[PDB]
Design a protein around this ligand. Sequence first.
Ligand SMILES: [Zn+2]
Lengths: 197, 124
Amino acid sequence: SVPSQKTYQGSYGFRLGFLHSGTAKSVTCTYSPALNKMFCQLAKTCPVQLWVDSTPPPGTRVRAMAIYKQSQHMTEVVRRCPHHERCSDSDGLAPPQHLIRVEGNLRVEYLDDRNTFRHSVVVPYEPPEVGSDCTTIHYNYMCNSSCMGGMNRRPILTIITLEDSSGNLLGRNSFEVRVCACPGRDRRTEEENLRKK
Amino acid sequence: DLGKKLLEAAWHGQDDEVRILMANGADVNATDQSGMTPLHLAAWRGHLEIVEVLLKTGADVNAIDRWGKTPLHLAARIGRLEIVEVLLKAGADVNAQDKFGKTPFDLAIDNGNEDIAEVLQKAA
Ligand SMILES: [Zn+2]
């Protein structure tokens, strides 16, 4: 069906955290809590922190999937535009059509769902390193929101699912994403619009 | 709903957003899906200044989440030394047991937080 976006903290108390990156002119990834929205540049590192109240068991997996936010587009699969699909920029793990990649994890797996045709990217859950409070995944978004052959200026959500080894739901969180040239400027603009409406 | 927004502002450490929401009377004792209040969330993430403003605003220092943890449990478990000290000053209950029977001291011990365990034992 249409993928769920509903927050579900679940038995392990699953939350997402993001860095405090501000709105400077050269910022590459920044998160607006007031919009629950990440603004990032194409292909740049986007750290997403997994915070759990208790440690889910070995074999747990973490899946990321993009959907269109607007109800009239939610049934359309989010894919890279043809230009970027053909530009030969895979890291050798990601299929060239996938919007969302994970960098720095050799155990990443990329899925094309045999029925829904939706793309997702999944890594094994690992607990925080010693001295760390959370587990960080480094995501990359491989098209701009404005890519005319693809997202074509339509907002997307990223859904992060904690799953057991069989794919059963353990927890779910989501955030809006805009992939753009100037994330700091656009964050400041959209936060100003919200404060005025 | 301003309580839902205050929960997320406190979790994400957005001090200006916390101030605006509280200036509009957002419910300081709102609870998220896990029963955590803004004070729980700020304690967990280590946002000391947000913890302090919530305590000056009548947040329940001993509110319990769905697992029976108070904010002091969270601060002791994850190693938030300054937050432990301000919670104790505000009347946090060192004897409160969560649903695993653990006090904040027990969680400090279990997580290797030696300095915090000493602070809690002196306050026992
Ligand atoms: Zn593109």
